[PDB]
Every structure is written in C-alpha cells, then in structure tokens.
Nucleic acid binder design. Structure first.
Ligand SMILES: [Ca+2]
Ligand SMILES: [Ca+2]
Length: 427
DNA sequence: TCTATGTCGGGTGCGGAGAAAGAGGTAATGAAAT
DNA sequence: ATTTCATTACCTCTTTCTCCGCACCCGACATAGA
C-alpha cells in the first residue's frame, strides 16, 4: 500500500504509476519474473516517508543547490518493509556493582502499543563471572548456526520504532539489480541494415559507448587520446569488425553508416542532444556492461585506492539520469555529485557539472575488463562474482493521513516486486 | 534547393588527486527492569 | 544476578565535494553530392 503516483517497474520492463495498475497486468518480480496482480487495495490511512540516507551535505547549507534524487517511496503505516539485518556478535567485557559477556543480534519478539506481538531482531546479552572457553563457546555457536550473514525479515513501518537502538541502525533495505532482459538492442540491429554478425551487437555497443563520451553531437565521429594505444587499437579493431575504417585526436569511421543508424535509431541522440536511452536499462546485461566500458574508456577515470570504482562526468542531465539507471540496473552502487554553475573572474561561464560515481568491486570489475583504455582496464573477476541486491540505510518520517494505492500479488508468490527505482517492496 | 562531412575560432567542460565528512560498527559505562 | 538499553566517543570504510585552467568541443559554414 503505497502513495498515489509512486512509480512501479512493470514486468515487461516498462514503468507505470501505481495509480493505474489494473488487475491482470504483471509487475516486475525481483528475480526478473512476472508477478500477477489480482487485488487492488485502496483506501486512506496515515502515510510514511521512506528515503535513503546518504553522506550528501550540500543542500543543508546552501539553498537552490539541487536536491539529490535518492531512492524513496511513501507507503501506509501498516505496510511491511522488506528489511535486512547483520548477524553480529562481539565479546564485550564489563564490571558492574562489583564484579565477560557475549552480545548478539537475535531473532525475537516484543510487545507493541496494541496487543500485537511483532517478530523482529533484538540485541541479546549473556555474560558470566570473570571468575574462558565459555564466552568463546557462547560465540562459536552463534557463528555456526547459519550461513546467511544476515536476517531477511519484514516489518511494518509503524513497528520500526519498536526496534532497539543498535539493531535499528544496523537495519537496512535493498534494491535489486534489473535481471530482466530485453533484446531491444538485438532485434533492432537484425531488424535493419545488411549487417555482419557474431559480435555485432558488441562492438556496436562499445562504439555507442565511446561516442556518448567523446563523440561530436552531429555525426558518427569521435575523439581519442593518441597516447592510449590499446584504445587507439580497440577502435581500429572494432571499427574493422563492424566493417568500417579509421596530443588528442578525432577519428572518423567511414564505410550509409551503421553507427549513425544507431545513434539515431535507438535514440542515443534525442532531438539534437545526447542521451542514454532508457530501454538500455533492461536489455541483455552484457550489452549494458559493454556500453559502459566504452563510456568508461571515453570519459571516466578509474582508481583502486579504496576498492575499484569509476567516476564519470557530464553536464547534460539526460546523460546523467540515463547512466544512473543503467549502472543501477547492473547492480552497481551509484551516487551523483553536482557542481554549481560557477562564473569566474578569469572570465569564463561554467555550467552545472554532474559527476556520477560508481562502485561494486566484482560487479564493476566485470565491466572494466571489457575496456581497452590503458588506464581504465582491469582484469576480469577470477570466478563467479556477486550480482546480489544492494543494501541501503534509511530514514522514516511520520506523515499525513492520506489516500493509498495498492496491488496484491497472486496468492502464491514471493509477494515482492521492484519499484521503478529498483527498491524491493512487499505488496 | 536541400543532406553529409572538411576544418576553423572562441570558450567551456571536466581531467585528476585527494582529504574529510558521514554512516554504522565497536566498546565503554551507568541505571533500571526482570 | 544477570540481562536490557540508550548514548557517547572513536575507528573503519566509502563516498561526497572542491579547486582551477587549458586543450578538446560545439558551433558554423563552405562545399560536394543528389
Ligand atoms: Ca567527453
Ligand atoms: Ca575524454
């Protein structure tokens, strides 16, 4: 039971406003599979604000500094949040009125304002007199009573408050990568031009990538750093592959050019300016990743200082947003920084600069391995790497008793779908 | 007369490295509930 | 006699924010096609 206007993520990949979902359509299941709707719960009740927490500070001090889009939804007071919480245990040692210990996060119960007995996690202490192997055992056990390193459980907004203090902070929600896979990049290509296949959609994507970053906004041409040979080469090789030919430099690709019939066809360039089309967020993952590599080789530097990551820049909002979702559909974590439209004495006019940040170790490394940049590339993950739903902490603020719009999932499903934003919610 | 692709000039985007702020995790510590 | 909880101060880990100029881009126009 959400708020009127809350954007959902339809099964086919689309996006619709909860307030339009008709009984018999299919929302997006966290695993990529459809969730059938049958009941459309409606009515009023006190609402709740759920918004992610972020080390964003800018707006607090200065006003008119754009507010950060940040993952949020507004549900009713009884709605079940799909939360998660770490299984922790620390051996604290202490002295009371005169005279070890083992504190843990356990699965427990607690009394609500009403009779209601809600399940949830609570900090549990248990210690004996200093006057050895006990506290050890009292732990080893907790460590060997499960594989999961967390508890997956649900809790209604109105009950979060009953949560402890330690636990309450340790508790976070999640947003699942978009595993669904459309083939709107594939069918397009084949649905057109006298193409050459086997890696077609690939090199295409990579180039489609570059272009976005370093590519003139009126034709299939682009800059490349002469110093980076691997890149220099990748374009060459790839160009050849697509069946086309070749400080800083501009490289043109002449054969009636495929690339252009892409930058147009799939709408990478929208009525004049550049833009990472939406569809891309829900097409063959690989494709996605490639398209990213390109964009990373083109414009975005990489570092490992504090764990692998890649920062991309740009001033067109279209690209901003577009990149955001795409990276977010890949299960990469992403935050956006915006630089003001400063005007300097050195006589210059600067516009609002957006710097998109991305991280995720193994998930990212799988992108960077497909890159050519001398300084961008990173060897692919040895074995299989996680593409697990990403967690996030959040604030909850009480609200107005307003109307709610809801949908109930088939009496036989995970009862969890993805909101357009990709945050996992319970029906 | 009307679409691509050389190529030329003023000015802005964003390239690049870090340091520092926040967030939650850890432990410490005191007083009340069980 | 433990076991329950908040809160506080500090440590760990990532992620926001900034600082500033010059070389790379965008914008334009001419010109070859058609
Ligand atoms: Ca660029
Ligand atoms: Ca570049």
């Amino acid at each position: 039971c959400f708020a009127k206007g809350t954007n959902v993520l339809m099964a086919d990949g689309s996006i619709e406003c909860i307030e339009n979902i008709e009984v018999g359509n299919k929302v997006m299941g966290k695993d990529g599979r459809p969730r059938e709707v049958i009941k459309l719960p409606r009515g009023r009740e006190t609402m709740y604000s759920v918004v992610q927490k972020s080390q964003h500070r800018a707006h607090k001090s200065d006003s008119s500094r754009e507010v950060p889009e940040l993952l949020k939804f507004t549900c009713n007071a009884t709605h079940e949040l799909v939360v998660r919480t770490p299984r922790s245990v620390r051996r604290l040692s202490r002295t009371i009125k005169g005279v070890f210990e083992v504190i843990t996060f356990e699965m427990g119960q607690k009394k609500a304002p009403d009779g209601r007995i809600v399940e949830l996690v609570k900090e549990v202490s248990k210690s004996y007199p200093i006057s050895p192997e006990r506290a050890n055992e009292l732990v080893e056990s907790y460590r060997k009573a499960s594989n999961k390193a967390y508890f997956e459980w649900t809790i209604e907004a109105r009950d979060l408050s009953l949560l402890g203090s330690h636990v309450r902070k340790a508790t976070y929600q999640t947003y699942a990568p978009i595993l669904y896979e459309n083939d709107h990049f594939f069918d397009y290509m084949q649905k057109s031009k006298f193409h050459l296949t086997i890696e077609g959609p690939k090199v295409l994507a990579y180039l489609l990538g570059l272009w976005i970053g370093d590519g003139l906004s009126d034709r299939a041409t682009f800059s490349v750093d002469s110093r980076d040979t691997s890149l220099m080469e990748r374009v060459t090789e790839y160009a050849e592959k697509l069946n086309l030919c070749a400080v800083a430099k501009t490289v043109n690709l002449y054969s009636e050019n495929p690339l252009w019939d892409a930058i147009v066809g799939l709408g990478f360039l929208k009525d004049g300016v550049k833009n990472i089309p939406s569809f891309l967020s829900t097409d063959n993952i690989g494709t996605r990743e490639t398209f990213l590599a390109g964009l990373i080789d083109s414009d975005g530097y990489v570092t490992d200082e504090h764990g692998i990551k890649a920062t991309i820049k740009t001033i067109h909002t279209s690209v901003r947003d577009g990149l955001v979702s795409l990276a977010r559909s890949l299960g990469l974590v992403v935050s956006v920084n915006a630089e003001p439209a400063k005007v300097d004495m050195n006589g210059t006019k600067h516009k609002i600069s957006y710097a998109i940040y991305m991280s995720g170790g193994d998930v990212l490394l799988n992108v960077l391995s497909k890159c050519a940049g001398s300084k961008k590339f990173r060897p692919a993950p040895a074995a299989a790497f996680a593409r697990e739903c990403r967690g996030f902490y959040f604030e909850l603020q009480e609200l107005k008793e307003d109307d709610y719009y809801g949908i109930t999932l088939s009496d036989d499903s995970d009862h969890q779908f993805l909101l357009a934003n990709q945050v996992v919610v319970h029906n």
